[PDB]
Amino acid sequence: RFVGLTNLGATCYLASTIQQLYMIPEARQAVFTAKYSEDMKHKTTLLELQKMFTYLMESECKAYNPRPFCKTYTMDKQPLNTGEQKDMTEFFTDLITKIEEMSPELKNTVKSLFGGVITNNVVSLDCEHVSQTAEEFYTVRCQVADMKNIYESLDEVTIKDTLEGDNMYTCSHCGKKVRAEKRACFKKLPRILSFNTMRYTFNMVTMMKEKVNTHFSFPLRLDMTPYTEDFLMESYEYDLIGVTVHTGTADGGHYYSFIRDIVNPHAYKNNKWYLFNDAEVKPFDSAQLASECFGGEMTTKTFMDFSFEKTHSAYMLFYKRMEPEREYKFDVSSELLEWI
C-alpha cells in the first residue's frame, strides 16, 4: 500500500521530508525522469533519491533502509550523521536546493513547484523615493506564539511597519531622515506552498529555546490573495495536502507526517490521508487533524480532570495550488525497474 522509511537512529526529519516529496506527483516524476550530465553537482544523491522513490513505489517490502542515501549526503560538515536530529525545515530546504543545483531543468521545475518571491518594500512618507528588493524563498516561516491561526501569522509576516521618531529611515536617494512604511508582500507563490509553523522562543533568562504548545489552527482551504503584491501594493487558493508534525522538545523531539493521497484519484475524491511514521504507514482520519495538529490543551482523569497542553503539533504545512481542471504515469527508467 505505502512503504515506510526505516529510522537509522534519529532520522525522523528525513522520512517526513522524503515522504512528502514522494507524495507530490510533480516532484516524484521530475526525479524519475531527471537528466544526468557528466559534471553535475549532486550525481550520487540523485541516483540514491531515484532508488528511494523507486523502492517506495514498487517494493513489496514494508520499509526502505535509507542508509545508501545518507552515506552520499553532505550538508555542512562532510557527512550526514545518522544519530543527530536535524531541523526538518533546514533539511527540506537543503534537499530542494540540491535538486535545484542538479541541472537547469531541475532548477526550473523546483523554482516553479516549491519556490516563491517575497518583495520587501519601503515607501517614504516624507520624500518621493521608494526602495524595493526581492527575496526568494522555499518555505515561509510563520510565528505561532501569540497567534491564533495561520492568517494571523501571515498578517504578521506581511505587517506594514512605520519607521518613525527614533527609528527614522534614511532614504539613500536624498540622504534625508524620513518616516517610511516598510512591508513584506508575496510577489510570486509556488505551486506547493510550505509553511514552517515555528513554535520556539528564546527564553533569555534560561538562555535556551522553549517550545510553545498553545492552540494554532489552519484551514483545509487557504486564500493567499490578501497577502499578494497586487492586493497589498494564476490562482491564489490552496488545498492542504500535508502536515509534518513535531512532538516533544527541540532537543529530544521527533517528527511524523499526515499526508493526503493526491496521486490516486478515485481515492483523492474520497479525501484519504495517511500517517507516515518511519517504517509504519497507516490510514488517517483527517477529521482528527485539529486534535493531532492544532496543539492547545487537553484533559485527562487523575477523581479530577488534569489539564495539559499537547506537545505534538504542526511543524510544517504543505498546501497545493487549486487548478480549475489526472491518473499519473510515472516513468521509472528501465534500469531502475530492473534493480527493484
- What positions carry a catalytic annotation? 12, 254
By CB under 5 A, residue 171 contacts Zn ion: yes
Question: In whole angstroms, how close is the CB of 10 to Zn ion at the nearest point?
Answer: 52
By CB under 5 A, residue 180 contacts Zn ion: no
Q: Is the dihedral of CA 209, 212, 217, 223 positive or negative?
A: negative
Cα–Cα distance measured from residue 112 to residue 130, given in angstroms and rounded to the nearest whole number: 28
Q: Which stretch binds Zn ion (CB under 5 A): 55-63, 150-158, 163-171, 268-276?
A: 163-171
Residue 328: phi and psi, rounded to 5, are -85, 135
Question: In whole angstroms, how close is the CB of 159 to Zn ion at the nearest point?
Answer: 23
Contact between 309 and 296 (Cβ < 8 Å): yes
> Cell 524519475 belongs to which residue?
32
Q: Which stretch binds Zn ion (CB under 5 A): 15-23, 100-108, 132-140, 170-178?
A: 170-178
Question: In whole angstroms, how close is the CB of 187 to Zn ion at the nearest point?
Answer: 23
Q: Is the dihedral of CA 312, 316, 320, 326 positive or negative?
A: negative
CA distances from 143 to 171, 214, 289, 319, 333 (A): 30, 12, 20, 17, 42
Nearer to Zn ion, 171 or 222 (CB): 171
What is the maximal distance between C-alpha atoms in the chain? 72
By CB under 5 A, residue 173 contacts Zn ion: yes
- How many residues form the binding site for Zn ion (CB under 5 A)? 5
Q: Is residue 44 helix, strand or coil?
A: helix
Nearer to Zn ion, 128 or 234 (CB): 128
Nearer to Zn ion, 23 or 180 (CB): 180
Question: In whole angstroms, how close is the CB of 118 to Zn ion at the nearest point?
Answer: 23
Q: What does the block give as the cell for 129?
A: 523615493
Question: In whole angstroms, how close is the CB of 129 to Zn ion at the nearest point?
Answer: 4
Nearer to Zn ion, 7 or 124 (CB): 124
Nearer to Zn ion, 62 or 177 (CB): 177
Question: In whole angstroms, how close is the CB of 165 to Zn ion at the nearest point?
Answer: 18
By CB under 5 A, residue 233 contacts Zn ion: no
Alpha helical stretches, state H, the chain = 12-22, 25-32, 43-58, 67-71, 88-102, 104-113, 150-157, 229-232, 265-268, 289-293, 334-339
Which 4-63 residues touch Zn ion, going by CB under 5 A? none
Contact between 321 and 191 (Cβ < 8 Å): yes
Cα–Cα distance measured from residue 259 to residue 194, given in angstroms and rounded to the nearest whole number: 13
Question: In whole angstroms, how close is the CB of 273 to Zn ion at the nearest point?
Answer: 53
Q: What does the block give as the cell for 258?
A: 499526515
Q: Residue 142: beta bridge partners?
A: 197
Nearer to Zn ion, 61 or 174 (CB): 174
Which 129-148 residues touch Zn ion, going by CB under 5 A? 129
Which 244-283 residues touch Zn ion, going by CB under 5 A? none
Q: From the list 61, 174, 208, 340, which residue makes contact with Zn ion (rule: CB under 5 A)?
A: 174
Q: Which stretch binds Zn ion (CB under 5 A): 89-97, 174-182, 282-290, 327-335?
A: 174-182
Which 98-127 residues touch Zn ion, going by CB under 5 A? 127
Of 179, 183, 161, 159, nearest to 171 (Cα)? 179
Cα–Cα distance measured from residue 228 to residue 233, given in angstroms and rounded to the nearest whole number: 8
Nearer to Zn ion, 71 or 173 (CB): 173
Per CB under 5 A, residues contacting Zn ion are 127, 129, 171, 173-174
